[PDB]
Design a protein around this ligand. Sequence first.
Ligand code: ZN
Length: 326
Amino acid sequence: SAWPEEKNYHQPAILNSSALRQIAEGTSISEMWQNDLQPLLIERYPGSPGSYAARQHIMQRIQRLQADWVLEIDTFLSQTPEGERSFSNIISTLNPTAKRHLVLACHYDSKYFSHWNRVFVGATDSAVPCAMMLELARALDKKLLSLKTVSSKPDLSLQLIFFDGEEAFLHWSPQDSLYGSRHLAAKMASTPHPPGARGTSQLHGMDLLVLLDLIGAPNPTFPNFFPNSARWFERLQAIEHELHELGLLKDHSLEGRYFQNYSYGGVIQDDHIPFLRRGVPVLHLIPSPFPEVWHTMDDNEENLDESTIDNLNKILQVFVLEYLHL
Ligand SMILES: [Zn+2]
């Protein structure tokens, strides 16, 4: 059937002024900060105590929500420059049997550095993306709970992926990066979806991969990377502009906007690559340039910008609701 092409024709159900006002009010940055972010600001490379703790924190936070989230741990072993290691992607899915999902993702591992005095906690990279996904889940819980109800809607729902092993152990290389994402995209490619089908895989079921990385620095600028997601990127610009106009964003100017008209010269390697090379459409919400503090001990909580993240939470939540027609 043509169901795998439905994503090509899929349209947002755009929210009005009062609904935008409701979403903006519904998200709490101080809450996210204390309850979702802070517990992740720890060293969490693969096999570390913090890796276990982060995965426990992600799972608990999702589990407390009303929405019908089904959690799985995609755990596997790989060789690495330090010897064999275990990796565990966290996948959180509403309506696992719906043929189509909008997929949001980031990586929850932090890059290994030897202590300076100091410890690398990857605040923007990617503790904040993780927290943004968890705040989204929380803020949107009641609207997401309606997806439990079956009927007059497309066969479409939401998935969250928190990848393990995004970072290289030593120098970045095709074999020493993307442990989690290379593994999972190969698993999904080889798995029938829906169950019992012929031809189609779980990759066909991915409407759009929205990959958050390196979020939390002030005045980020996001290029529109890919023509095949450019219409969805333009929605983020429209949502940004409108929230701005309605007075719903803080410390935000039009001249200082996040989402840009221009594209990007090179090719950024990230968790989306194994999906993108197999034809999954990608909306890659990583800034250019990268934050100043990138891969530095100063990628920490103090160098994060609260209003930026708050504003980005509002824009992402609106986008997700519009996509899902909620
Ligand atoms: Zn990094």
